[PDB]
Design a protein around this ligand. Structure first.
Ligand code: GPP
Ligand code: GPP
Lengths: 227, 227
């Protein structure tokens, strides 16, 4: 009836800001950041075991340097809030912090490392992430390990398995997402948790992410249960 | 405007039959088969370049033997019709025919091989298909080619790339799906063209597959164009 793992693509932040009459789209990102905090609280309280939030795609990283820097600061603030010790949430980065700049990477890593490995609620923060890239990096990790274990070249050709890839993703050892929520009426896909979401329920709302409400979350859960 | 590649998950054949008071739900598959042929005609006439139709997943192959026997025969008929010389359609099998039995596999392969390599309309028939397995088999093919070209084990560990995977999938040489059509109100992913559909537009109808009509196809194209 209830998802174990909900994944959320937080779309529409800039559109939201423009609709509200703001010239600076960071107003959108800041409100989206507030909604991320809300959503994770809802998930925890509803008994969801794991939530993954899509904070920064590799696509996002191609944008105006100044705007991007501001966004990355908002994201780092978000993660630091997620990692607050009063929450007692276990947190994991999903993606490549090598892409966000070293000072933000240090701050993010520091926050995430401060969280317990064992907790009732787990949060994945997807930063500097792409789904196809993740699979490639999983394969490379898999093969690297096999080589270290004395695999021959011809053994490396046969070493790759579905289970071997799964075990080498960022999400190694976690249940796959049961429910993937996307906002802004986007029914495209965008490769978020590409491998892991192969059998996930998709749920869509027209509302932009900063406008996402607790009752929208309730509808998502109700729709999921009904399916 | 127009999708280059439409992918169709023909869900709801059994449910349609059950809903319409049919004791034998194989009948749903037969109605669904007729609809596949019509859909492909609509695609061709509308100027879509490539259509992929999901006929048999690796899951589907664990049904009741009487039902599975009927389904496999019906799928074989569907493919034989798609491959009819009068269509002049170029057809490709997407999946592992080793999973459907020797005699059906023989018939399917014969039909598909009889079709032209060059044609204005192309149809992928997905039979014995699993998306995660496809990626694994692509990676294995990739590495095998590297080994054949003289790569060392050391070099193999780092040989895998996003483009390398795409080039070694069943759909090598083809555009990824632009539009994925799902019926029966299903919004649950099924690993169908998993890698390829990372960025595809998803479109949903409540109509069960055997109830799918040209007006619904037109709606999908309109909705696609408007997105
Ligand atoms: C000849 C055809 C149409 C082949 C397609 C087979 C595939 C779509 C699954 C058939 O079962 P189902 O999943 O459609 O039944 P249901 O979804 O109602 O359980
Ligand atoms: C703190 C938050 C919510 C971070 C998410 C940042 C990123 C994933 C959104 C990019 O802009 P956008 O895609 O949301 O703008 P729009 O979709 O309107 O173009």
């Amino acid at each position: 009836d209830l998802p174990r793992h909900i994944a959320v693509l937080c779309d529409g932040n800039r559109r939201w800001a423009r609709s509200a009459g703001y010239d600076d789209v960071s107003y959108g990102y800041r409100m989206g950041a507030a909604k991320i905090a809300e959503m994770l609280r809802w998930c925890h309280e509803a008994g969801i075991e794991l939530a993954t939030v899509y904070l920064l795609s590799t696509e996002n990283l191609q944008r105006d340097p100044d705007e991007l820097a501001a966004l990355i600061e908002i994201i780092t603030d978000v993660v630091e809030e997620i990692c607050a010790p009063a929450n007692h949430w276990s947190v994991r980065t999903v993606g490549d912090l090598g892409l966000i700049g070293e000072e933000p990477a240090r701050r993010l890593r520091g926050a995430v490392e401060s969280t317990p490995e064992v907790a009732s609620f787990h949060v994945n923060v997807a930063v500097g992430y792409g789904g196809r890239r993740e699979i490639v990096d999983a394969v490379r990790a898999l093969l690297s390990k096999e080589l270290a274990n004395g695999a021959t070249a011809e053994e490396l050709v046969d070493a790759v398995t579905v289970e071997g890839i799964s075990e080498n993703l960022y999400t190694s050892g976690q249940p796959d997402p049961d429910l993937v929520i996307r906002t802004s009426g986007e029914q495209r896909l965008s490769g978020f948790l590409l491998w892991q979401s192969a059998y996930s329920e998709m749920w869509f709302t027209e509302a932009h992410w900063p406008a996402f409400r607790h009752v929208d979350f309730l509808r998502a859960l109700r729709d999921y249960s009904a399916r």
